[PDB]
Amino acid sequence: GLFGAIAGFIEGGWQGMVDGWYGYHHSNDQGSGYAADKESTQKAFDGITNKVNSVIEKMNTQFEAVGKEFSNLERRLENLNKKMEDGFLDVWTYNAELLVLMENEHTLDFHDSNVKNLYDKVRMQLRDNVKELGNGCFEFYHKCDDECMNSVKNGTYDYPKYEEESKLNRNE
Amino acid sequence: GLFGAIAGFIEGGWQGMVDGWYGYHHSNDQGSGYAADKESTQKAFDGITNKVNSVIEKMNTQFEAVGKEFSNLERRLENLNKKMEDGFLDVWTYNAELLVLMENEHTLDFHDSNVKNLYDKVRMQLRDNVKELGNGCFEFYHKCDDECMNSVKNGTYDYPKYEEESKLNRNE
Amino acid sequence: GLFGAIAGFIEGGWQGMVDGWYGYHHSNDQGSGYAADKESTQKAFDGITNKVNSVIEKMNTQFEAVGKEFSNLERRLENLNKKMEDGFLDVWTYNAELLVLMENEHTLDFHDSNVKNLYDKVRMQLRDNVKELGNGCFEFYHKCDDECMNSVKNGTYDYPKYEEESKLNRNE
Amino acid sequence: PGDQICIGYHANNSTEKVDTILERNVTVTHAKDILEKTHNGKLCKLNGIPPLELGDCSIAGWLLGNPECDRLLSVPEWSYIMEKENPRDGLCYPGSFNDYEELKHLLSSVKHFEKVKILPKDRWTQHTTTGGSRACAVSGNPSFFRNMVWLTEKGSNYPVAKGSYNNTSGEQMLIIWGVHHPNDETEQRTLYQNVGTYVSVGTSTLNKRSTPEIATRPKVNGQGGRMEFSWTLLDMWDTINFESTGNLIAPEYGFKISKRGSSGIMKTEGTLENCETKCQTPLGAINTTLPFHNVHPLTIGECPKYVKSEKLVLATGLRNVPQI
Amino acid sequence: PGDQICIGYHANNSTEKVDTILERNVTVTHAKDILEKTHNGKLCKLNGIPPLELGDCSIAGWLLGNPECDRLLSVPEWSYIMEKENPRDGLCYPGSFNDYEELKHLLSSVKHFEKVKILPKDRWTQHTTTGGSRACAVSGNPSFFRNMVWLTEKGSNYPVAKGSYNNTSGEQMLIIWGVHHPNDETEQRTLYQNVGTYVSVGTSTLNKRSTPEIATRPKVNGQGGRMEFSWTLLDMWDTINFESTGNLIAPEYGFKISKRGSSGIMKTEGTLENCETKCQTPLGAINTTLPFHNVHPLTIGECPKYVKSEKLVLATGLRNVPQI
Amino acid sequence: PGDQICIGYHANNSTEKVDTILERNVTVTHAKDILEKTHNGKLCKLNGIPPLELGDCSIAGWLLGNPECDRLLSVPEWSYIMEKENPRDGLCYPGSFNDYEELKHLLSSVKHFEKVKILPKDRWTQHTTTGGSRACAVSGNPSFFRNMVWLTEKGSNYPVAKGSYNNTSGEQMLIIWGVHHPNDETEQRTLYQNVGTYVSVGTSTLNKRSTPEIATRPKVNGQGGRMEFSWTLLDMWDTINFESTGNLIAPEYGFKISKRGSSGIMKTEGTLENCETKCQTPLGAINTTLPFHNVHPLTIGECPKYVKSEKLVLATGLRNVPQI
Numbered sequence A, B, C: 001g002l003f004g005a006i007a008g009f010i011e012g013g014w015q016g017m018v019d020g021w022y023g024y025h026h027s028n029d030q031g032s033g034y035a036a037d038k039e040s041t042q043k044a045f046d047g048i049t050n051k052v053n054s055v056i057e058k059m060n061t062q063f064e065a066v067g068k069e070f071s072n073l074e075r076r077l078e079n080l081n082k083k084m085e086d087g088f089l090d091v092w093t094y095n096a097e098l099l100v101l102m103e104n105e106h107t108l109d110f111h112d113s114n115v116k117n118l119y120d121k122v123r124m125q126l127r128d129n130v131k132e133l134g135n136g137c138f139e140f141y142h143k144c145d146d147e148c149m150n151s152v153k154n155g156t157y158d159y160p161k162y163e164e165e166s167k168l169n170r171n172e
Numbered sequence D, E, F: 001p002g003d004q005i006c007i008g009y010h011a012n013n014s015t016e017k018v019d020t021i022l023e024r025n026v027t028v029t030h031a032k033d034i035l036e037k038t039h040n041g042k043l044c045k046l047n048g049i050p051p052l053e054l055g056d057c058s059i060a061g062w063l064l065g066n067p068e069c070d071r072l073l074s075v076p077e078w079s080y081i082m083e084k085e086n087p088r089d090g091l092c093y094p095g096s097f098n099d100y101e102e103l104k105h106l107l108s109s110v111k112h113f114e115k116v117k118i119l120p121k122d123r124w125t126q127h128t129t130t131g132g133s134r135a136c137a138v139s140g141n142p143s144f145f146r147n148m149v150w151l152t153e154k155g156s157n158y159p160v161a162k163g164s165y166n167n168t169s170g171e172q173m174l175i176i177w178g179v180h181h182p183n184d185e186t187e188q189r190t191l192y193q194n195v196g197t198y199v200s201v202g203t204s205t206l207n208k209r210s211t212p213e214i215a216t217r218p219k220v221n222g223q224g225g226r227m228e229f230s231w232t233l234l235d236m237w238d239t240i241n242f243e244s245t246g247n248l249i250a251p252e253y254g255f256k257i258s259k260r261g262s263s264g265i266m267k268t269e270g271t272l273e274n275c276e277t278k279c280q281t282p283l284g285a286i287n288t289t290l291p292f293h294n295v296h297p298l299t300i301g302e303c304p305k306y307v308k309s310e311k312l313v314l315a316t317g318l319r320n321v322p323q324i
């Protein structure tokens, strides 16, 4: 996709992450597991909710066919009425069908951007305290216990705190 | 947003940068200050100017309601005329309203792409002569005076020129 | 463009790469040359093929003008017919013209994303076994012969295989 | 071999498909179908109010009072009207109904009539009023449209017939009248005595006259003659005047519009069932909260918007990508 | 603690809001409102050319010459026509005007007439031409439509009335005539002497006849009789012929179309003010360079395009993000 | 100075331009023009079936049998009809044709007639049938529409004329008749003997009558009189009855609809050429696989969709960027 993350450098999705759209898998001495990123998921959810409302609300006044009848000496008027009601019908079918294809494309790319953005947020915070493995994972140069993991996951990882230890480990 | 820079890794906008959309804040021994990037701003300005013209010019022939009258034995024809003039009115309202929501989304993401792109341009030029702080700023490993800053800002920063000094400083 | 690669950090296109949209130029002891990336090109080709079909297929039922005639005591009906046939004509002209401008924008950005994505795929695989020059090229820290080049080009470059040699060379 | 954190995305067992511009048939983790495709196959009350079921009667059969339509002599408020494609019971005495489609269009904004006896039959003291036809026979005897009066010769005379009604009912009133075009002269004389007759109707805005046409026509329901009907909406406080030397088919009644609103005539061969809906189509009733439907373009009530699409499914989740 | 360069973006004090697909009510640094919502509340000259202000007259009152419309006996070129919803002064002698809406539609492409005296009254030497009605009274005396001639009996005779006009004016010419449908026989005889009359009109393409209808009708403006008017556009070099044994209401004039162009009839109760505009609506005039407006769908002149929207604001700048 | 791998993109010599939202006139490596702008300038057979070329005849001239239209007395199946803007040969005896546009609209779904001699001339034994006019002269002698019969006085009498036809042809049948409105009384008497005449037509659904109008009119093709024509589509197994004391212009023929389908009347001054197409326009034929065209809105056959655009070019390749 457009942002290169979903079905991209992050090769597959996670069946085991059941409580949100995007998130984390961690692995340390204490063990491993999945957790959704609540903030990115909530933002995406609000965005998508707004989108569906907007598409729907923009087609609340479309054309409505009114039943009318015409005599056998009113064929031109009948055909005009038919062409007209058919015409609007075709316009609204096209509008609904196009809007949906276009917004589906954007929706899928929006999720892809959100994953890439979360990845970059984490990356740009860990800096050189980690190895970037290339598959969506970062390998730490310092031991990172459960509380350390939680600081990463909520955006309060302390780079200066681990700078000295990682640098030594990265070099020996 | 889609490109992760605006209200993203670059957390806020700058009130003190009054002469363009995107740009720089520098800080050295000589002092500090803001400057717009003229080239990226001009390109964005030309793009946005074209966009507004294009939306406008695409709706220069829309429907126009013509006043007509109908007798009391011409109710079907009157209703046909009404449904028709109403129908086109609703089509053009939808077209104008949709085009504007869709293009607003793209406009906001376009500015976001432009900021990310300018950031990446600077990054990909400074390479490892700087620390990437993660907030839109780069910290230099070599002293970078006003003239050095100007080379960065106009895309003619000389990496080989500072390679030796930075590498030594980065290591000791 | 939106993804910063085409007419971006990769400054120009290659006349000498005649067999696809995106690809590689390599340079080693054995010599140099161009090669298309078949997989990214094929995916883009399938995407673009689908897009043109979709735009076309969405306008297979549009309005068609039917020839009718009206007496000199049927001027209101004639004008209604005219306004109607004109109205749909203007709607479909706008639809066709807009769809094309919008999809052209997306097409050009799609190619740009595809190039950036291929670049990132290669980058994220080579990691620190190469220098990122900033112009779309990577400079190797280990000798990379024709067979090594082919592993890069098909996504099976072996980082562990060259890790030790590159690290030594990068440091001395 | 250090500790790791990985960024990733949801995947589930969803097989929900969507289309996009670049790719068709994409599996996504969550999707929203926005197109209603189902209905209950029944004709129903609309918000508790039953339609007017015409059965075998046409609008004309109803309003003229074709004796085969007697169940409709008094009807309550309706929500829509059900008419068959080709109802059997319309003009039992054959003829025509001027501006008939315009009258049917009026019915789309009317939800009830009060039938008012505007010109009581008993007041035509100088004319015979018991005239009927085998074409409108009832129990083997000649009869006639229940709402109309066939004025004929009395004591071998037909004096000028004049009737007048001032609409004091409080609403606009639909009034129908006719002119009999006989097959031949023997018919004109036996019925009306006079030759060279006319039927004149006048209100403040309408001035409509007919001279009857004697002419040989193919038999319809056994009759070569024809009755040509016309109608008007008589405004409040306006007067309609009838005047005739013969061939007048007079209304006895007017239909006061007693309830106005959004309505319509639905063409259907079906019958009303004991069910309730907010949105009726000719195929059946819709009960959905979805914004679009593809059931039928001609709906009545509070309905989704109609489109021709076979499918409309919005992606809400992301691409559903198989595990590694 | 080295030197730094930072990449960033503009922010200001803007509170301009826009909507997008994903988010409503977004503050941006710059925005362009593309919807005109205001007008001056006045009816104005359009490009220096004043409308034709009918005041209390209808189109019919004007063209027939209802004596209450005498200010309109000669009018200069107009840019649009202002007519009230229900003008008081139309058919002062009551009746009808055939194809009246079609005539009004013709007026949308006409910007001036020259009224031509095609059939001077003085030339009806065998008929009385001074006939009027209390329904068109002027200063307490019976009078008549100024543009028309009521031909009646002279010396207890009404010989066949024939008038003819060849359109040599250089443009198509609008001509109106009428037929009087009397209330009764005493009226038919006192006015026309003859019974069993007709009014015939013929051009190269039109052949239209009437036999007058004597019939009792409710009084309108005091009259039970009616005048039914008809019209034609007489082509250049074509001849119109009138022929009648009675009941003819003859035109004395024709209206030569002297200026053609985009025009129209605006329905309004208002009056012309001393102001100037390029774009007139029934609510007032618009003066904007914006591409859209939401003022009123029925505009005349060089106008923005109308939409129902309450707002249309394009983002031009970026998201306006609070300082750190 | 190590080995290198570079990522890049295609560039060629393309000068193909496209527009986008942000930028006009962009050079791209590949593009797809989706708008057909060309045609062959000819009128052609449509799928091997030639149009009906009316030449100088109007639809009315054809169906009435104006003697200048004799090449059209028997025509084979057509794919469209070519009519001139102002054909010379229509009503040679002047008059009018009621519901003429409605008849032309019927022709849009008809592709062939079989002309059936429904009322053979020889069967009018009590009337003269050889009547013609200098207005329809042939070789210097008075003649008449080939499909119609001008019934006149025989032996100074015109008995009631009655003709009847039951449509047993197997399809709906178009039937035309007329009424002669004479210039004067001498004409009415010399032709019909009777005064105070009528023409009556009746089917199961139509009851249409005329009384002829004697009136002075400008000469058209030398004639002050007029023939007013009317038509009906006679249903299968229905009967049409004509009845007249004078002034009847009877059909001798009916046109049985023998082929139905999508067709139409194309307005053109041109002539059929020896060429073949799937899509005909008034300017010429289109042969393309492109989805859109901008040639002319009024097309017949299997056509692309029409738009007003001057250009529609989709980008397929990428931005074509000059070498470094």
Ligand SMILES: *[C@@H]1O[C@H](CO)[C@@H](O[C@@H]2O[C@H](CO)[C@@H](O)[C@H](O)[C@H]2NC(C)=O)[C@H](O)[C@H]1NC(C)=O
Pocket: D166, D167, D168, D237, D238, D239, E218, E219
């Ligand atoms: C028809 O009936 C009405 C009601 O009695 C007559 O009387 C007045 O008519 C006006 C006309 O609009 C009504 O508004 C009033 O309700 C009546 N008011 C008074 C004071 O009488 C009307 O005149 C009758 N028409 C005729 C021709 O007699």
Ligand SMILES: *[C@@H]1O[C@H](CO)[C@@H](O[C@@H]2O[C@H](CO)[C@@H](O)[C@H](O)[C@H]2NC(C)=O)[C@H](O)[C@H]1NC(C)=O
Pocket: E166, E167, E168, E237, E238, E239, F218, F219
């Ligand atoms: C009506 O007036 C015209 C103008 O005098 C008459 O004369 C000619 O008519 C033709 C018809 O189109 C005009 O083009 C010319 O201006 C006139 N030319 C000549 C040489 O006379 C016309 O004949 C008159 N009609 C009648 C019935 O008398």
Ligand SMILES: *[C@@H]1O[C@H](CO)[C@@H](O[C@@H]2O[C@H](CO)[C@@H](O)[C@H](O)[C@H]2NC(C)=O)[C@H](O)[C@H]1NC(C)=O
Pocket: D218, D219, F166, F167, F168, F237, F238, F239
């Ligand atoms: C007109 O011709 C038909 C065909 O002969 C007559 O006879 C029947 O008419 C019905 C009416 O729809 C047709 O369906 C049949 O083909 C005929 N069947 C039989 C058994 O006769 C018809 O009656 C004729 N009309 C008149 C008035 O005589």
Ligand SMILES: *[C@@H]1O[C@H](CO)[C@@H](O)[C@H](O)[C@H]1NC(C)=O
Pocket: A147, A148, A150, A151, A154, A156
């Ligand atoms: C984030 O996570 C840390 C580590 O568990 C926790 O102690 C802290 O309260 C959280 N801080 C914020 C700002 O949410």
Ligand SMILES: *[C@@H]1O[C@H](CO)[C@@H](O)[C@H](O)[C@H]1NC(C)=O
Pocket: B147, B148, B150, B151, B154, B156
């Ligand atoms: C860019 O900036 C430098 C440093 O101030 C200046 O000397 C030079 O002329 C500029 N070069 C270009 C190519 O704009």
Ligand SMILES: *[C@@H]1O[C@H](CO)[C@@H](O)[C@H](O)[C@H]1NC(C)=O
Pocket: C147, C148, C150, C151, C154, C156
């Ligand atoms: C990829 O390229 C290498 C190097 O030439 C080749 O040996 C190998 O078979 C290819 N592998 C795959 C999985 O395509």
Ligand SMILES: *[C@@H]1O[C@H](CO)[C@@H](O)[C@H](O)[C@H]1NC(C)=O
Pocket: D025
């Ligand atoms: C869509 O995809 C499914 C499974 O991925 C496949 O079985 C099927 O062929 C496709 N359906 C259609 C209608 O093309």
Ligand SMILES: *[C@@H]1O[C@H](CO)[C@@H](O)[C@H](O)[C@H]1NC(C)=O
Pocket: E025
């Ligand atoms: C929009 O945002 C403003 C300020 O951010 C807020 O005060 C207001 O509630 C919002 N307006 C609407 C109409 O929702």
Ligand SMILES: *[C@@H]1O[C@H](CO)[C@@H](O)[C@H](O)[C@H]1NC(C)=O
Pocket: F025
């Ligand atoms: C488009 O670009 C070409 C070459 O890049 C240039 O010569 C020309 O001026 C432009 N054409 C138009 C129509 O603006």
